[PDB]
Scaffold this active site. Structure first.
Site, PDB file in Angstrom:
ATOM      1  N   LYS A  10       1.832  -8.429  -4.049  1.00  0.00           N
ATOM      2  CA  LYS A  10       2.772  -7.400  -3.621  1.00  0.00           C
ATOM      3  C   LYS A  10       3.962  -7.126  -4.542  1.00  0.00           C
ATOM      4  O   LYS A  10       4.295  -7.949  -5.395  1.00  0.00           O
ATOM      5  CB  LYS A  10       3.261  -7.754  -2.200  1.00  0.00           C
ATOM      6  CG  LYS A  10       2.147  -7.736  -1.147  1.00  0.00           C
ATOM      7  CD  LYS A  10       2.661  -7.728   0.291  1.00  0.00           C
ATOM      8  CE  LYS A  10       1.500  -7.477   1.253  1.00  0.00           C
ATOM      9  NZ  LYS A  10       1.838  -7.655   2.698  1.00  0.00           N
ATOM     10  N   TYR A  50      -3.250   1.234   5.416  1.00  0.00           N
ATOM     11  CA  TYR A  50      -2.683   0.640   6.621  1.00  0.00           C
ATOM     12  C   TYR A  50      -2.815   1.675   7.745  1.00  0.00           C
ATOM     13  O   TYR A  50      -1.957   1.753   8.626  1.00  0.00           O
ATOM     14  CB  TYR A  50      -1.187   0.326   6.420  1.00  0.00           C
ATOM     15  CG  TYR A  50      -0.876  -0.806   5.461  1.00  0.00           C
ATOM     16  CD1 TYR A  50      -1.259  -2.128   5.753  1.00  0.00           C
ATOM     17  CD2 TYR A  50      -0.244  -0.557   4.244  1.00  0.00           C
ATOM     18  CE1 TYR A  50      -1.026  -3.166   4.856  1.00  0.00           C
ATOM     19  CE2 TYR A  50      -0.001  -1.584   3.335  1.00  0.00           C
ATOM     20  CZ  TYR A  50      -0.404  -2.894   3.648  1.00  0.00           C
ATOM     21  OH  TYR A  50      -0.220  -3.911   2.741  1.00  0.00           O
ATOM     22  N   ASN A 113       6.300 -10.237   2.131  1.00  0.00           N
ATOM     23  CA  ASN A 113       5.582 -11.495   1.969  1.00  0.00           C
ATOM     24  C   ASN A 113       5.007 -11.314   0.559  1.00  0.00           C
ATOM     25  O   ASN A 113       4.951 -10.197   0.066  1.00  0.00           O
ATOM     26  CB  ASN A 113       4.510 -11.715   3.055  1.00  0.00           C
ATOM     27  CG  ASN A 113       3.702 -10.479   3.374  1.00  0.00           C
ATOM     28  OD1 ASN A 113       3.561  -9.560   2.565  1.00  0.00           O
ATOM     29  ND2 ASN A 113       3.128 -10.471   4.562  1.00  0.00           N
ATOM     30  N   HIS A 116      -1.332 -10.303   0.067  1.00  0.00           N
ATOM     31  CA  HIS A 116      -2.101  -9.756   1.156  1.00  0.00           C
ATOM     32  C   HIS A 116      -3.498 -10.287   0.938  1.00  0.00           C
ATOM     33  O   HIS A 116      -3.951 -10.407  -0.199  1.00  0.00           O
ATOM     34  CB  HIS A 116      -2.194  -8.235   1.114  1.00  0.00           C
ATOM     35  CG  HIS A 116      -3.398  -7.703   1.839  1.00  0.00           C
ATOM     36  ND1 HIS A 116      -3.385  -7.402   3.188  1.00  0.00           N
ATOM     37  CD2 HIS A 116      -4.667  -7.479   1.422  1.00  0.00           C
ATOM     38  CE1 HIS A 116      -4.587  -7.008   3.563  1.00  0.00           C
ATOM     39  NE2 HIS A 116      -5.386  -7.044   2.515  1.00  0.00           N
ATOM     40  N   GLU A 127     -11.685  -3.053   2.982  1.00  0.00           N
ATOM     41  CA  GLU A 127     -10.522  -3.129   2.125  1.00  0.00           C
ATOM     42  C   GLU A 127     -10.936  -3.070   0.643  1.00  0.00           C
ATOM     43  O   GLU A 127     -10.350  -2.320  -0.138  1.00  0.00           O
ATOM     44  CB  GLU A 127      -9.720  -4.393   2.435  1.00  0.00           C
ATOM     45  CG  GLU A 127      -8.672  -4.205   3.544  1.00  0.00           C
ATOM     46  CD  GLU A 127      -8.044  -5.515   3.969  1.00  0.00           C
ATOM     47  OE1 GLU A 127      -7.977  -6.412   3.125  1.00  0.00           O
ATOM     48  OE2 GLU A 127      -7.620  -5.657   5.131  1.00  0.00           O
TER      49      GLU A 127
END
Lengths: 140, 140
Positions: A10, A50, A113, A116, A127
């Site tokens: 991320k 998402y 965070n 992922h 995904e």
């Protein structure tokens, strides 16, 4: 069974320049990155990924952050890759993650965070497909 | 002056799964990977990149190896990036490379050295352009 799973380093982890450190956690654990590319997600790209949270009140923040900077989307492949990945990443909420995990060591919050990882075979498959073409994945 | 340079983690280094370890050498040294993608070079792709050696007797082996498996082509950006990169990589010929360098620690031979780095501003510019579009490079 050897499987494939999607992993995303991320915006927060790349800005900290710990890309190599995270990669090493997967590689040391016996998983191989078989596909990978650094990019800046577009509003549209993050929203479609998402989509499931499309109507949740945290959507904007999820997308907002996840678009705040470039990321590294990739595919990890190995024995029990999906679950193995979830084990190295730690709890989604950094503050409830076991020490030694990626989130416990590099994450600042739920939004921020550090990584992922797909949570299941079914989501791993959609995904991975969402971000990569078969040609981009090089098993070995 | 902060500059951009091309770096390639070669087939031998990826097969050893030391991608993270190499990345960390650049990141720890203050350089940032601002563009990156894993791929399997085609005969044609490797040949056009090493066009300059097109007629040298080591060409086939250069291309041969450099196509033996997937690689990670990327862009490192930072202060004195081009030379800084050459310093971390070590001598092209692993056996004449100073300890601590990438080639001294991960390379097996001239063909099988672990990484590639541009040798100058002029070649950095054409090497980067050859593998990436401006949109793929995300400075930060």
């Amino acid at each position: 069974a050897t499987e494939r799973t999607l992993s995303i380093i991320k915006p927060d982890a790349v800005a900290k320049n710990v890309i190599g450190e995270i990669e090493s956690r997967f590689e040391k654990a016996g998983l191989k990155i078989v596909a990978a590319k650094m990019l800046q997600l577009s509003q549209e790209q993050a929203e479609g990924f998402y989509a499931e949270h499309k109507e949740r009140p945290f959507f904007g923040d999820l997308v907002g952050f996840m678009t705040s900077g470039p990321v590294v989307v990739q595919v990890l492949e190995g024995e029990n890759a999906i679950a193995a990945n979830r084990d190295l990443m730690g709890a989604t909420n950094p503050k409830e993650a076991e020490a030694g995990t990626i989130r416990a060591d590099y994450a600042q919050s739920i939004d921020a965070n550090a990584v992922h990882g797909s949570d299941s075979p079914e989501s791993a498959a959609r995904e991975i497909a969402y971000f990569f073409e078969e040609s981009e994945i090089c098993s070995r």
